[PDB]
């Protein structure tokens, strides 16, 4: 018993996607179906009845999205037009037991990521994060797509290196930071250089990090 | 529009409860409250529906109840397999479904650790380049659930925050990072900015100021 989604991806603001949900294992025509998207929580978007006769939308997507189904092929669709940044989410389709009436069937698909971004491939700008123990870093700001790799002193500094995971900004560009704790006494003896490498854009940046 | 606590925890064999607060026209008016468990990288599965009903297959230790405008999920005799995110759901009042924000249930098998927090002010180069990014880096806390608050002088700041959900480090503690985007004039025109990390009811704050 399974719901199999597809149709997501990276789309430009104003763009269109058509999400698909493919149903096997159960009597599709007999269940209301919903679309639910997930961001940091879950947000209910839309519902269509089993007999296709009746549809609901949350207000923010009214006018722009249209739910549809094809019972003859066990398929559920979400035509998304006029996409906004705020639409970026992991979209689930689901048969939800809200009123069971003796039938506790509840089933979700595996999700499909929609990211609304006008963002070309772009290498990062690398800025230094200058400083017992003392911490120093590299800001790897505004790149696309993922990932970057950070090392320090051509890989020869690795103890105390903590390269954190990246964030996806409103703008569609990613930023991460790499921070290393060195002994405070090392701030004169050692040169601290971070090496950021971003492969989709063939970008290799080095940046002196100095107090 | 349905409120859950950010996170809750307990040891193997303890009992924990997750509340879920709605309004009167929803949780207070219908018995259509469901709960969903979600594991990292997987889709939600229903644990409870119609307030207190359990599908066969969901362990007997999961129970749901409702009082006034607040539903609750209790998990008796905790087990490590019960660690996950749990979302409540209710009929919304007008052809409608609303979900809670999520709660992270941690089944503890490691002593707690407050986070350590490093705040970096905007670099010289980035201000040259006309941007300003405050970098809050958060390490080594357990459980992996933390609240990030920003402050210009003493007033809360929500505009421009983007924050990473906590990820397991190699030391099986968690890390998150937060970024406050500022114009260089906002940055230079307050006496200080602050990153407040609250974990387990203890708060680690870090402040930076313009120079």
């Amino acid at each position: 018993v399974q719901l199999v989604e597809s149709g997501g991806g990276v789309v430009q603001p104003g763009g269109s996607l058509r999400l698909s949900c493919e149903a096997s294992g159960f009597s599709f025509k007999d269940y209301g179906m919903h679309w639910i998207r997930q961001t940091p929580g879950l947000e209910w978007i839309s519902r269509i009845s089993g007999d296709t006769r009746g549809t609901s939308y949350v207000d923010s997507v009214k006018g722009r999205f249209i739910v549809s189904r094809d019972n003859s092929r066990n398929s559920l669709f979400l035509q998304m037009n006029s996409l906004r940044s705020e639409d970026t989410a992991l979209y689930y389709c689901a048969a939800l037991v809200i009123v069971a009436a003796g039938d506790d069937f509840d089933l979700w698909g595996q999700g499909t990521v929609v990211t609304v971004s006008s963002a070309s491939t772009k290498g990062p700008s690398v800025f230094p994060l200058a400083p017992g123990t003392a911490a120093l870093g590299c800001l790897v700001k505004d790149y696309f797509p993922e990932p970057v790799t950070v090392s320090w002193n051509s890989g020869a500094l690795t103890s105390g290196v903590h390269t954190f995971p990246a964030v996806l900004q409103s703008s569609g560009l990613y930023s991460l930071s790499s921070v290393v704790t060195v002994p405070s006494s090392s701030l004169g003896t050692q040169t601290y250089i971070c090496n950021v490498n971003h492969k989709p854009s063939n970008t290799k940046v080095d940046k002196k990090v100095e107090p | 529009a349905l409120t859950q606590p950010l996170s809750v925890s307990g040891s193997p064999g303890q009992s924990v409860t997750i509340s879920c607060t709605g309004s009167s026209s929803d949780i207070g008016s219908y018995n259509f409250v469901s709960w969903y468990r979600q594991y990292p990288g997987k889709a939600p599965k229903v644990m409870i529906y119609e307030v207190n009903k359990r599908p066969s297959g969901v362990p007997v230790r999961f129970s749901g109840s409702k009082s006034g405008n607040t539903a609750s999920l209790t998990v008796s005799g905790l087990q490590h397999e019960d660690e996950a995110d749990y979302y409540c759901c209710s009929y919304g009042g007008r052809n409608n479904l609303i979900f809670g924000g999520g709660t992270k249930l941690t089944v503890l098998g490691q002593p707690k650790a407050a986070p350590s927090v490093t705040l970096f002010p905007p670099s010289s180069e980035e201000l040259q380049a006309n941007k300003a990014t405050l970098v809050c880096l958060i390490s080594d806390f357990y459980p992996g659930a933390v609240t990030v608050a920003w402050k210009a002088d003493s007033s809360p700041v929500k505009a421009g925050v983007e924050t990473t959900t906590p990820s397991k480090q190699s030391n099986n503690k968690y890390a998150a990072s937060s970024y406050l985007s500022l114009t260089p004039e906002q940055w230079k025109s307050h006496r200080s900015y602050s990153c407040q990390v609250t974990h387990e009811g203890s708060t680690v704050e870090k402040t930076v100021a313009p120079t």
Partner: peptide
């Protein structure tokens, strides 16, 4: 299917 019947009415005003 009664679940269909009352769930449909539930999303009609």
């Amino acid at each position: 299917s009664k679940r269909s019947f009352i769930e449909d009415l539930l999303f009609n005003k």
